[PDB]
Design a binder for these strands. Sequence first.
DNA 1: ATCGGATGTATATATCTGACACGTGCCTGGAGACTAGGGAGTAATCCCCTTGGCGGTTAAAACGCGGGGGACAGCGCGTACGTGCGTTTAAGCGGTGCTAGAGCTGTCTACGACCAATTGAGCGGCCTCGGCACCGGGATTCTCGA
DNA 2: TCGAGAATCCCGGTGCCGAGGCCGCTCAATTGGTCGTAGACAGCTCTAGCACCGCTTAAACGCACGTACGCGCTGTCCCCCGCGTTTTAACCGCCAAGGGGATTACTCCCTAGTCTCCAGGCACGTGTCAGATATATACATCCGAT
Lengths: 105, 104, 69, 69, 96, 96, 82, 78, 93, 94
Amino acid sequence: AKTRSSRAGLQFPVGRVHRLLRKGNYAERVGAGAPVYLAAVLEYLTAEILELAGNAARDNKKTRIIPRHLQLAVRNDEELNKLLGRVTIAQGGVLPNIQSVLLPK
Amino acid sequence: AKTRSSRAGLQFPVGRVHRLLRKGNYAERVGAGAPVYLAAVLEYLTAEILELAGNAARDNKKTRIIPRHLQLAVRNDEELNKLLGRVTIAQGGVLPNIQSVLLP
Amino acid sequence: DEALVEELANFRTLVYCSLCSKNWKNMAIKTCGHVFCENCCKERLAARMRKCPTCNKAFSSNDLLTVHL
Amino acid sequence: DEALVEELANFRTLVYCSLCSKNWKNMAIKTCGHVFCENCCKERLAARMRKCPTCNKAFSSNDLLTVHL
Amino acid sequence: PHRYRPGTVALREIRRYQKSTELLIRKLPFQRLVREIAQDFKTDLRFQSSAVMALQEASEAYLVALFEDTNLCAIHAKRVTIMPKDIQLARRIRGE
Amino acid sequence: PHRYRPGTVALREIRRYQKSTELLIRKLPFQRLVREIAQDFKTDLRFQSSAVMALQEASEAYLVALFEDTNLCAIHAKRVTIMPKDIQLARRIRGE
Amino acid sequence: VLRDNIQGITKPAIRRLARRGGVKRISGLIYEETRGVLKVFLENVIRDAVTYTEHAKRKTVTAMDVVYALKRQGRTLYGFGG
Amino acid sequence: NIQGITKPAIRRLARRGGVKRISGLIYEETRGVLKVFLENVIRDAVTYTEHAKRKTVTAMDVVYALKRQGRTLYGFGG
Amino acid sequence: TRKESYAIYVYKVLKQVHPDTGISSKAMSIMNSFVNDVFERIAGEASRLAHYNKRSTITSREIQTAVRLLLPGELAKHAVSEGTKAVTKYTSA
Amino acid sequence: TRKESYAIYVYKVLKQVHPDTGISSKAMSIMNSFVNDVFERIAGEASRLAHYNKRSTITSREIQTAVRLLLPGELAKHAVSEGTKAVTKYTSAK
DNA sequence: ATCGGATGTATATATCTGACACGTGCCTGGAGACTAGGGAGTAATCCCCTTGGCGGTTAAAACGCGGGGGACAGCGCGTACGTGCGTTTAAGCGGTGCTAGAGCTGTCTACGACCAATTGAGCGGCCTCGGCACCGGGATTCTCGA
DNA sequence: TCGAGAATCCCGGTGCCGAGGCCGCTCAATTGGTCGTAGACAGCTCTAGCACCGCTTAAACGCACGTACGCGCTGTCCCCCGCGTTTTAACCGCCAAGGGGATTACTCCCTAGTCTCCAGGCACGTGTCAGATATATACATCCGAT
Ligand SMILES: [Zn+2]
Ligand SMILES: [Zn+2]
Ligand SMILES: [Zn+2]
Ligand SMILES: [Zn+2]
């Protein structure tokens, strides 16, 4: 007996998403292929950020991602920065930037 | 046979609120005393704003309530202005004020 | 002759962007040092493809450096 | 036909180092985007020639980047 | 040749226009603009009159509320004239 | 002896604090401040450690995000020193 | 098709809004800057109304799609049936 | 009390922000700004912790109170 | 078909505060939208607040605290009292 | 008792993009709380679309038009193209 | 500062219509009455976690002095914008015509809720060693008064 | 212009505790039927959105002229930055007591569900009067000569 995630060729669990949609008072009935569409979107967004953070985790000669590396991944790209526009990541810090008028001549 | 709203003593309908709250997918069950409590709060706010609107209309020698009086009454009161923060009223207008430095 | 044309053709492949074959090589990546044209590179950055066509190494926008001649 | 002979020489001087005319342009400068050969780069650092020839500016040790093709 | 000082007439238009409630842009020119913009997302589309009216009722409020805050940045810099560098700062501080 | 021109130390410490990541305010006085503020709503309360940590993180983020908006309107007046009027203008424009 | 209708927003029309806003003196280079701000506010609102009006299989924009689009951006509007 | 937020601590936050020169009246202004924000968060946290008949305000109440004010915070669960 | 509204109730309330004034049809729609927005965002906070505590029913206690989280300052102190005073009457009868 | 999280699935996704790279506990706790936030927004927006048109089932169309309403610009194209390719594979499977 | 002439802003009385307020028919949604079962209130208990106190280092805070750069005020000039007038353009209003699409009604079939039986996937508890933290030494770069 | 001095980086060695894998074990996802209602589809009605034309006439447009304001420059002086010395209490490690948060039984009563009945809120029709429009009149205001 196969699993629905394996049948759909995904990595995320489809049954748990199907149960969470049902036990959440969202609608009276839930369609068949709604979880298999919603679980394929939650994985692409995760794979995007986990790929953009691995470059930062390498430019600092590290081999283990820490929250600082996730902070620099969602602030250097417009698409993700506009989606997480009102989110404060703990232990994140800021982005190095100095106004051009302050520097000496 | 008495109405459910007359027992409480309100003007707003209790049964309509109950069936609207029991069919909007909020919770699996709805308590008996919830519509009575909710229909008494909805009645207070409307009277609160509709008295200020009436006074504003009366100060302009009119005898009706055009949308301008609503905007005036809302923008002249602190709590109401804070509650209705990011909302716009059609044909409302603007509160008259001029910067002090601009005058001669 | 053919040898004169062949060297002309051989050097032509070195000046033009391989993707476009229409503009001089202008844009270089710090990570790998490969040089392409500025126009072909930018459209890739809007297609969410951050891997080098040649050395496959990942890169970002800040790693783009202009070159002259 | 001298018509394509000039293009090859124009192509040749573009890729050859304008200093020695014997090496490819494989060592570029990060500060101002000019490209030369590695042969003509480290000889200048012997006398601390931080001033670039083309635009005449200073540089450093991390302003020289390896480039290919 | 009875002229006015440069600004006493502009100081009266503020009082005139802060007391009336009506649309300030011409209806046909504004309505053509919406139809021009909305033919790229999907062609051969139709609109109700109320949709156009409601779309116009919000742009007025947006522009008016934006012109109120750019008048504070000009006062901050000891001026009375509003330059294009104030609209950029006022729009950047509130995040857009 | 040896001295530095006014500004170099400021620039280097700016460069320093924009590369680190720990908390800037001391922990025990902040905890005391939170416990004192909470007293006026309901007496005899208790706090978890994580609640105080989250409060500190949120406060630091808010203050840091506000000091970098007051600086942007301090420059607009051809000035290089932040002022309470700059802070007030930034807060007013943001929409508090 | 219809083109270059952005010039229907005239200089007096722009200045009348500024008068209501409260300003007194207006610089020369304000009209072009302002015409580029209204053309961006009208894309975000319309791209959502069009999304709403085709999920329901219709081919005409109603007065409720605009209200929903304005509500989705924290700009709720009273008076049109919201 | 409010005197625990010392001047060097205030100035380090400004340095992280990116300012170079600070007027002498800034600290008094900023203390009264922070004191207003803390009250706004704590009142909602206390209402949340009081609705459930509890006596200890937990981290999840603070997270929810921050969330409903347009300021979400990752890293503490939920 | 038909469609429902709060027109009659709003008019009935209006003839209580000011017994000699009227109201226009254009402001009536605004008054009808305001009461739909307030009721929508008050009852949307109770469902989420009851989910936090692993409950299943929204009772009067879930609304008494949902009012306190939305109405600012002085307004809540009056709304809570007037809502509480109405339930006691209903329970007695 | 038991507690459920996406920590086991995020790690499986991570080892497909970067074969040799770890992740710390705080980073895992942040990546866990981001997925819930996105999931609570998509479904919450899809419910209102069903309510508006007097319907009662959340099918695959509401999810598609709710993704096209929240994600900005160019992300939506890829998200839709990745969802509509998984659905067709699922429906024509064993 | 003190009058005066002209201009735009209130102030008072017809008149006239289209929207507000009121009345009636009728149908569907709300009020009564009874039943069953599961959510929620209440009592006991136990064990983690919060509060409180004590002693040593030492890192950070407090205080004082010198001086140099930046905030601010006063002047002068010239270009850009406000005000008024004559001419031109397109908006606003009315009326007519036609047809594409919204909204409602009746069928019926395929799809999702619901229940009984299985089994393997994901969670809790334990080990272990290697990546990262930390410290001590040179080598390179950056600033300032000559 | 460049040397003295201070801050910063590259490298090597040592150590430790948290990530990564492993194993046993519940209970939740999977199969397999069954049924009844939501929704897809075809057809009909009618209304409201689009296209065109003619006639005012209000407003957009171009031009001349003057002047108030933006911008650059110069000077005085006072207040904030850098640096050294002294006083404080934050931080770490350790210990102990008890409160209340979480968990498990047990019961009971309050809300969902069904059937019956009828009055209240809604669609449609009609009178009439509140306010919009026009007009003559009183006055506050402003810029100039003095
Ligand atoms: Zn190319
Ligand atoms: Zn490469
Ligand atoms: Zn060379
Ligand atoms: Zn150069």
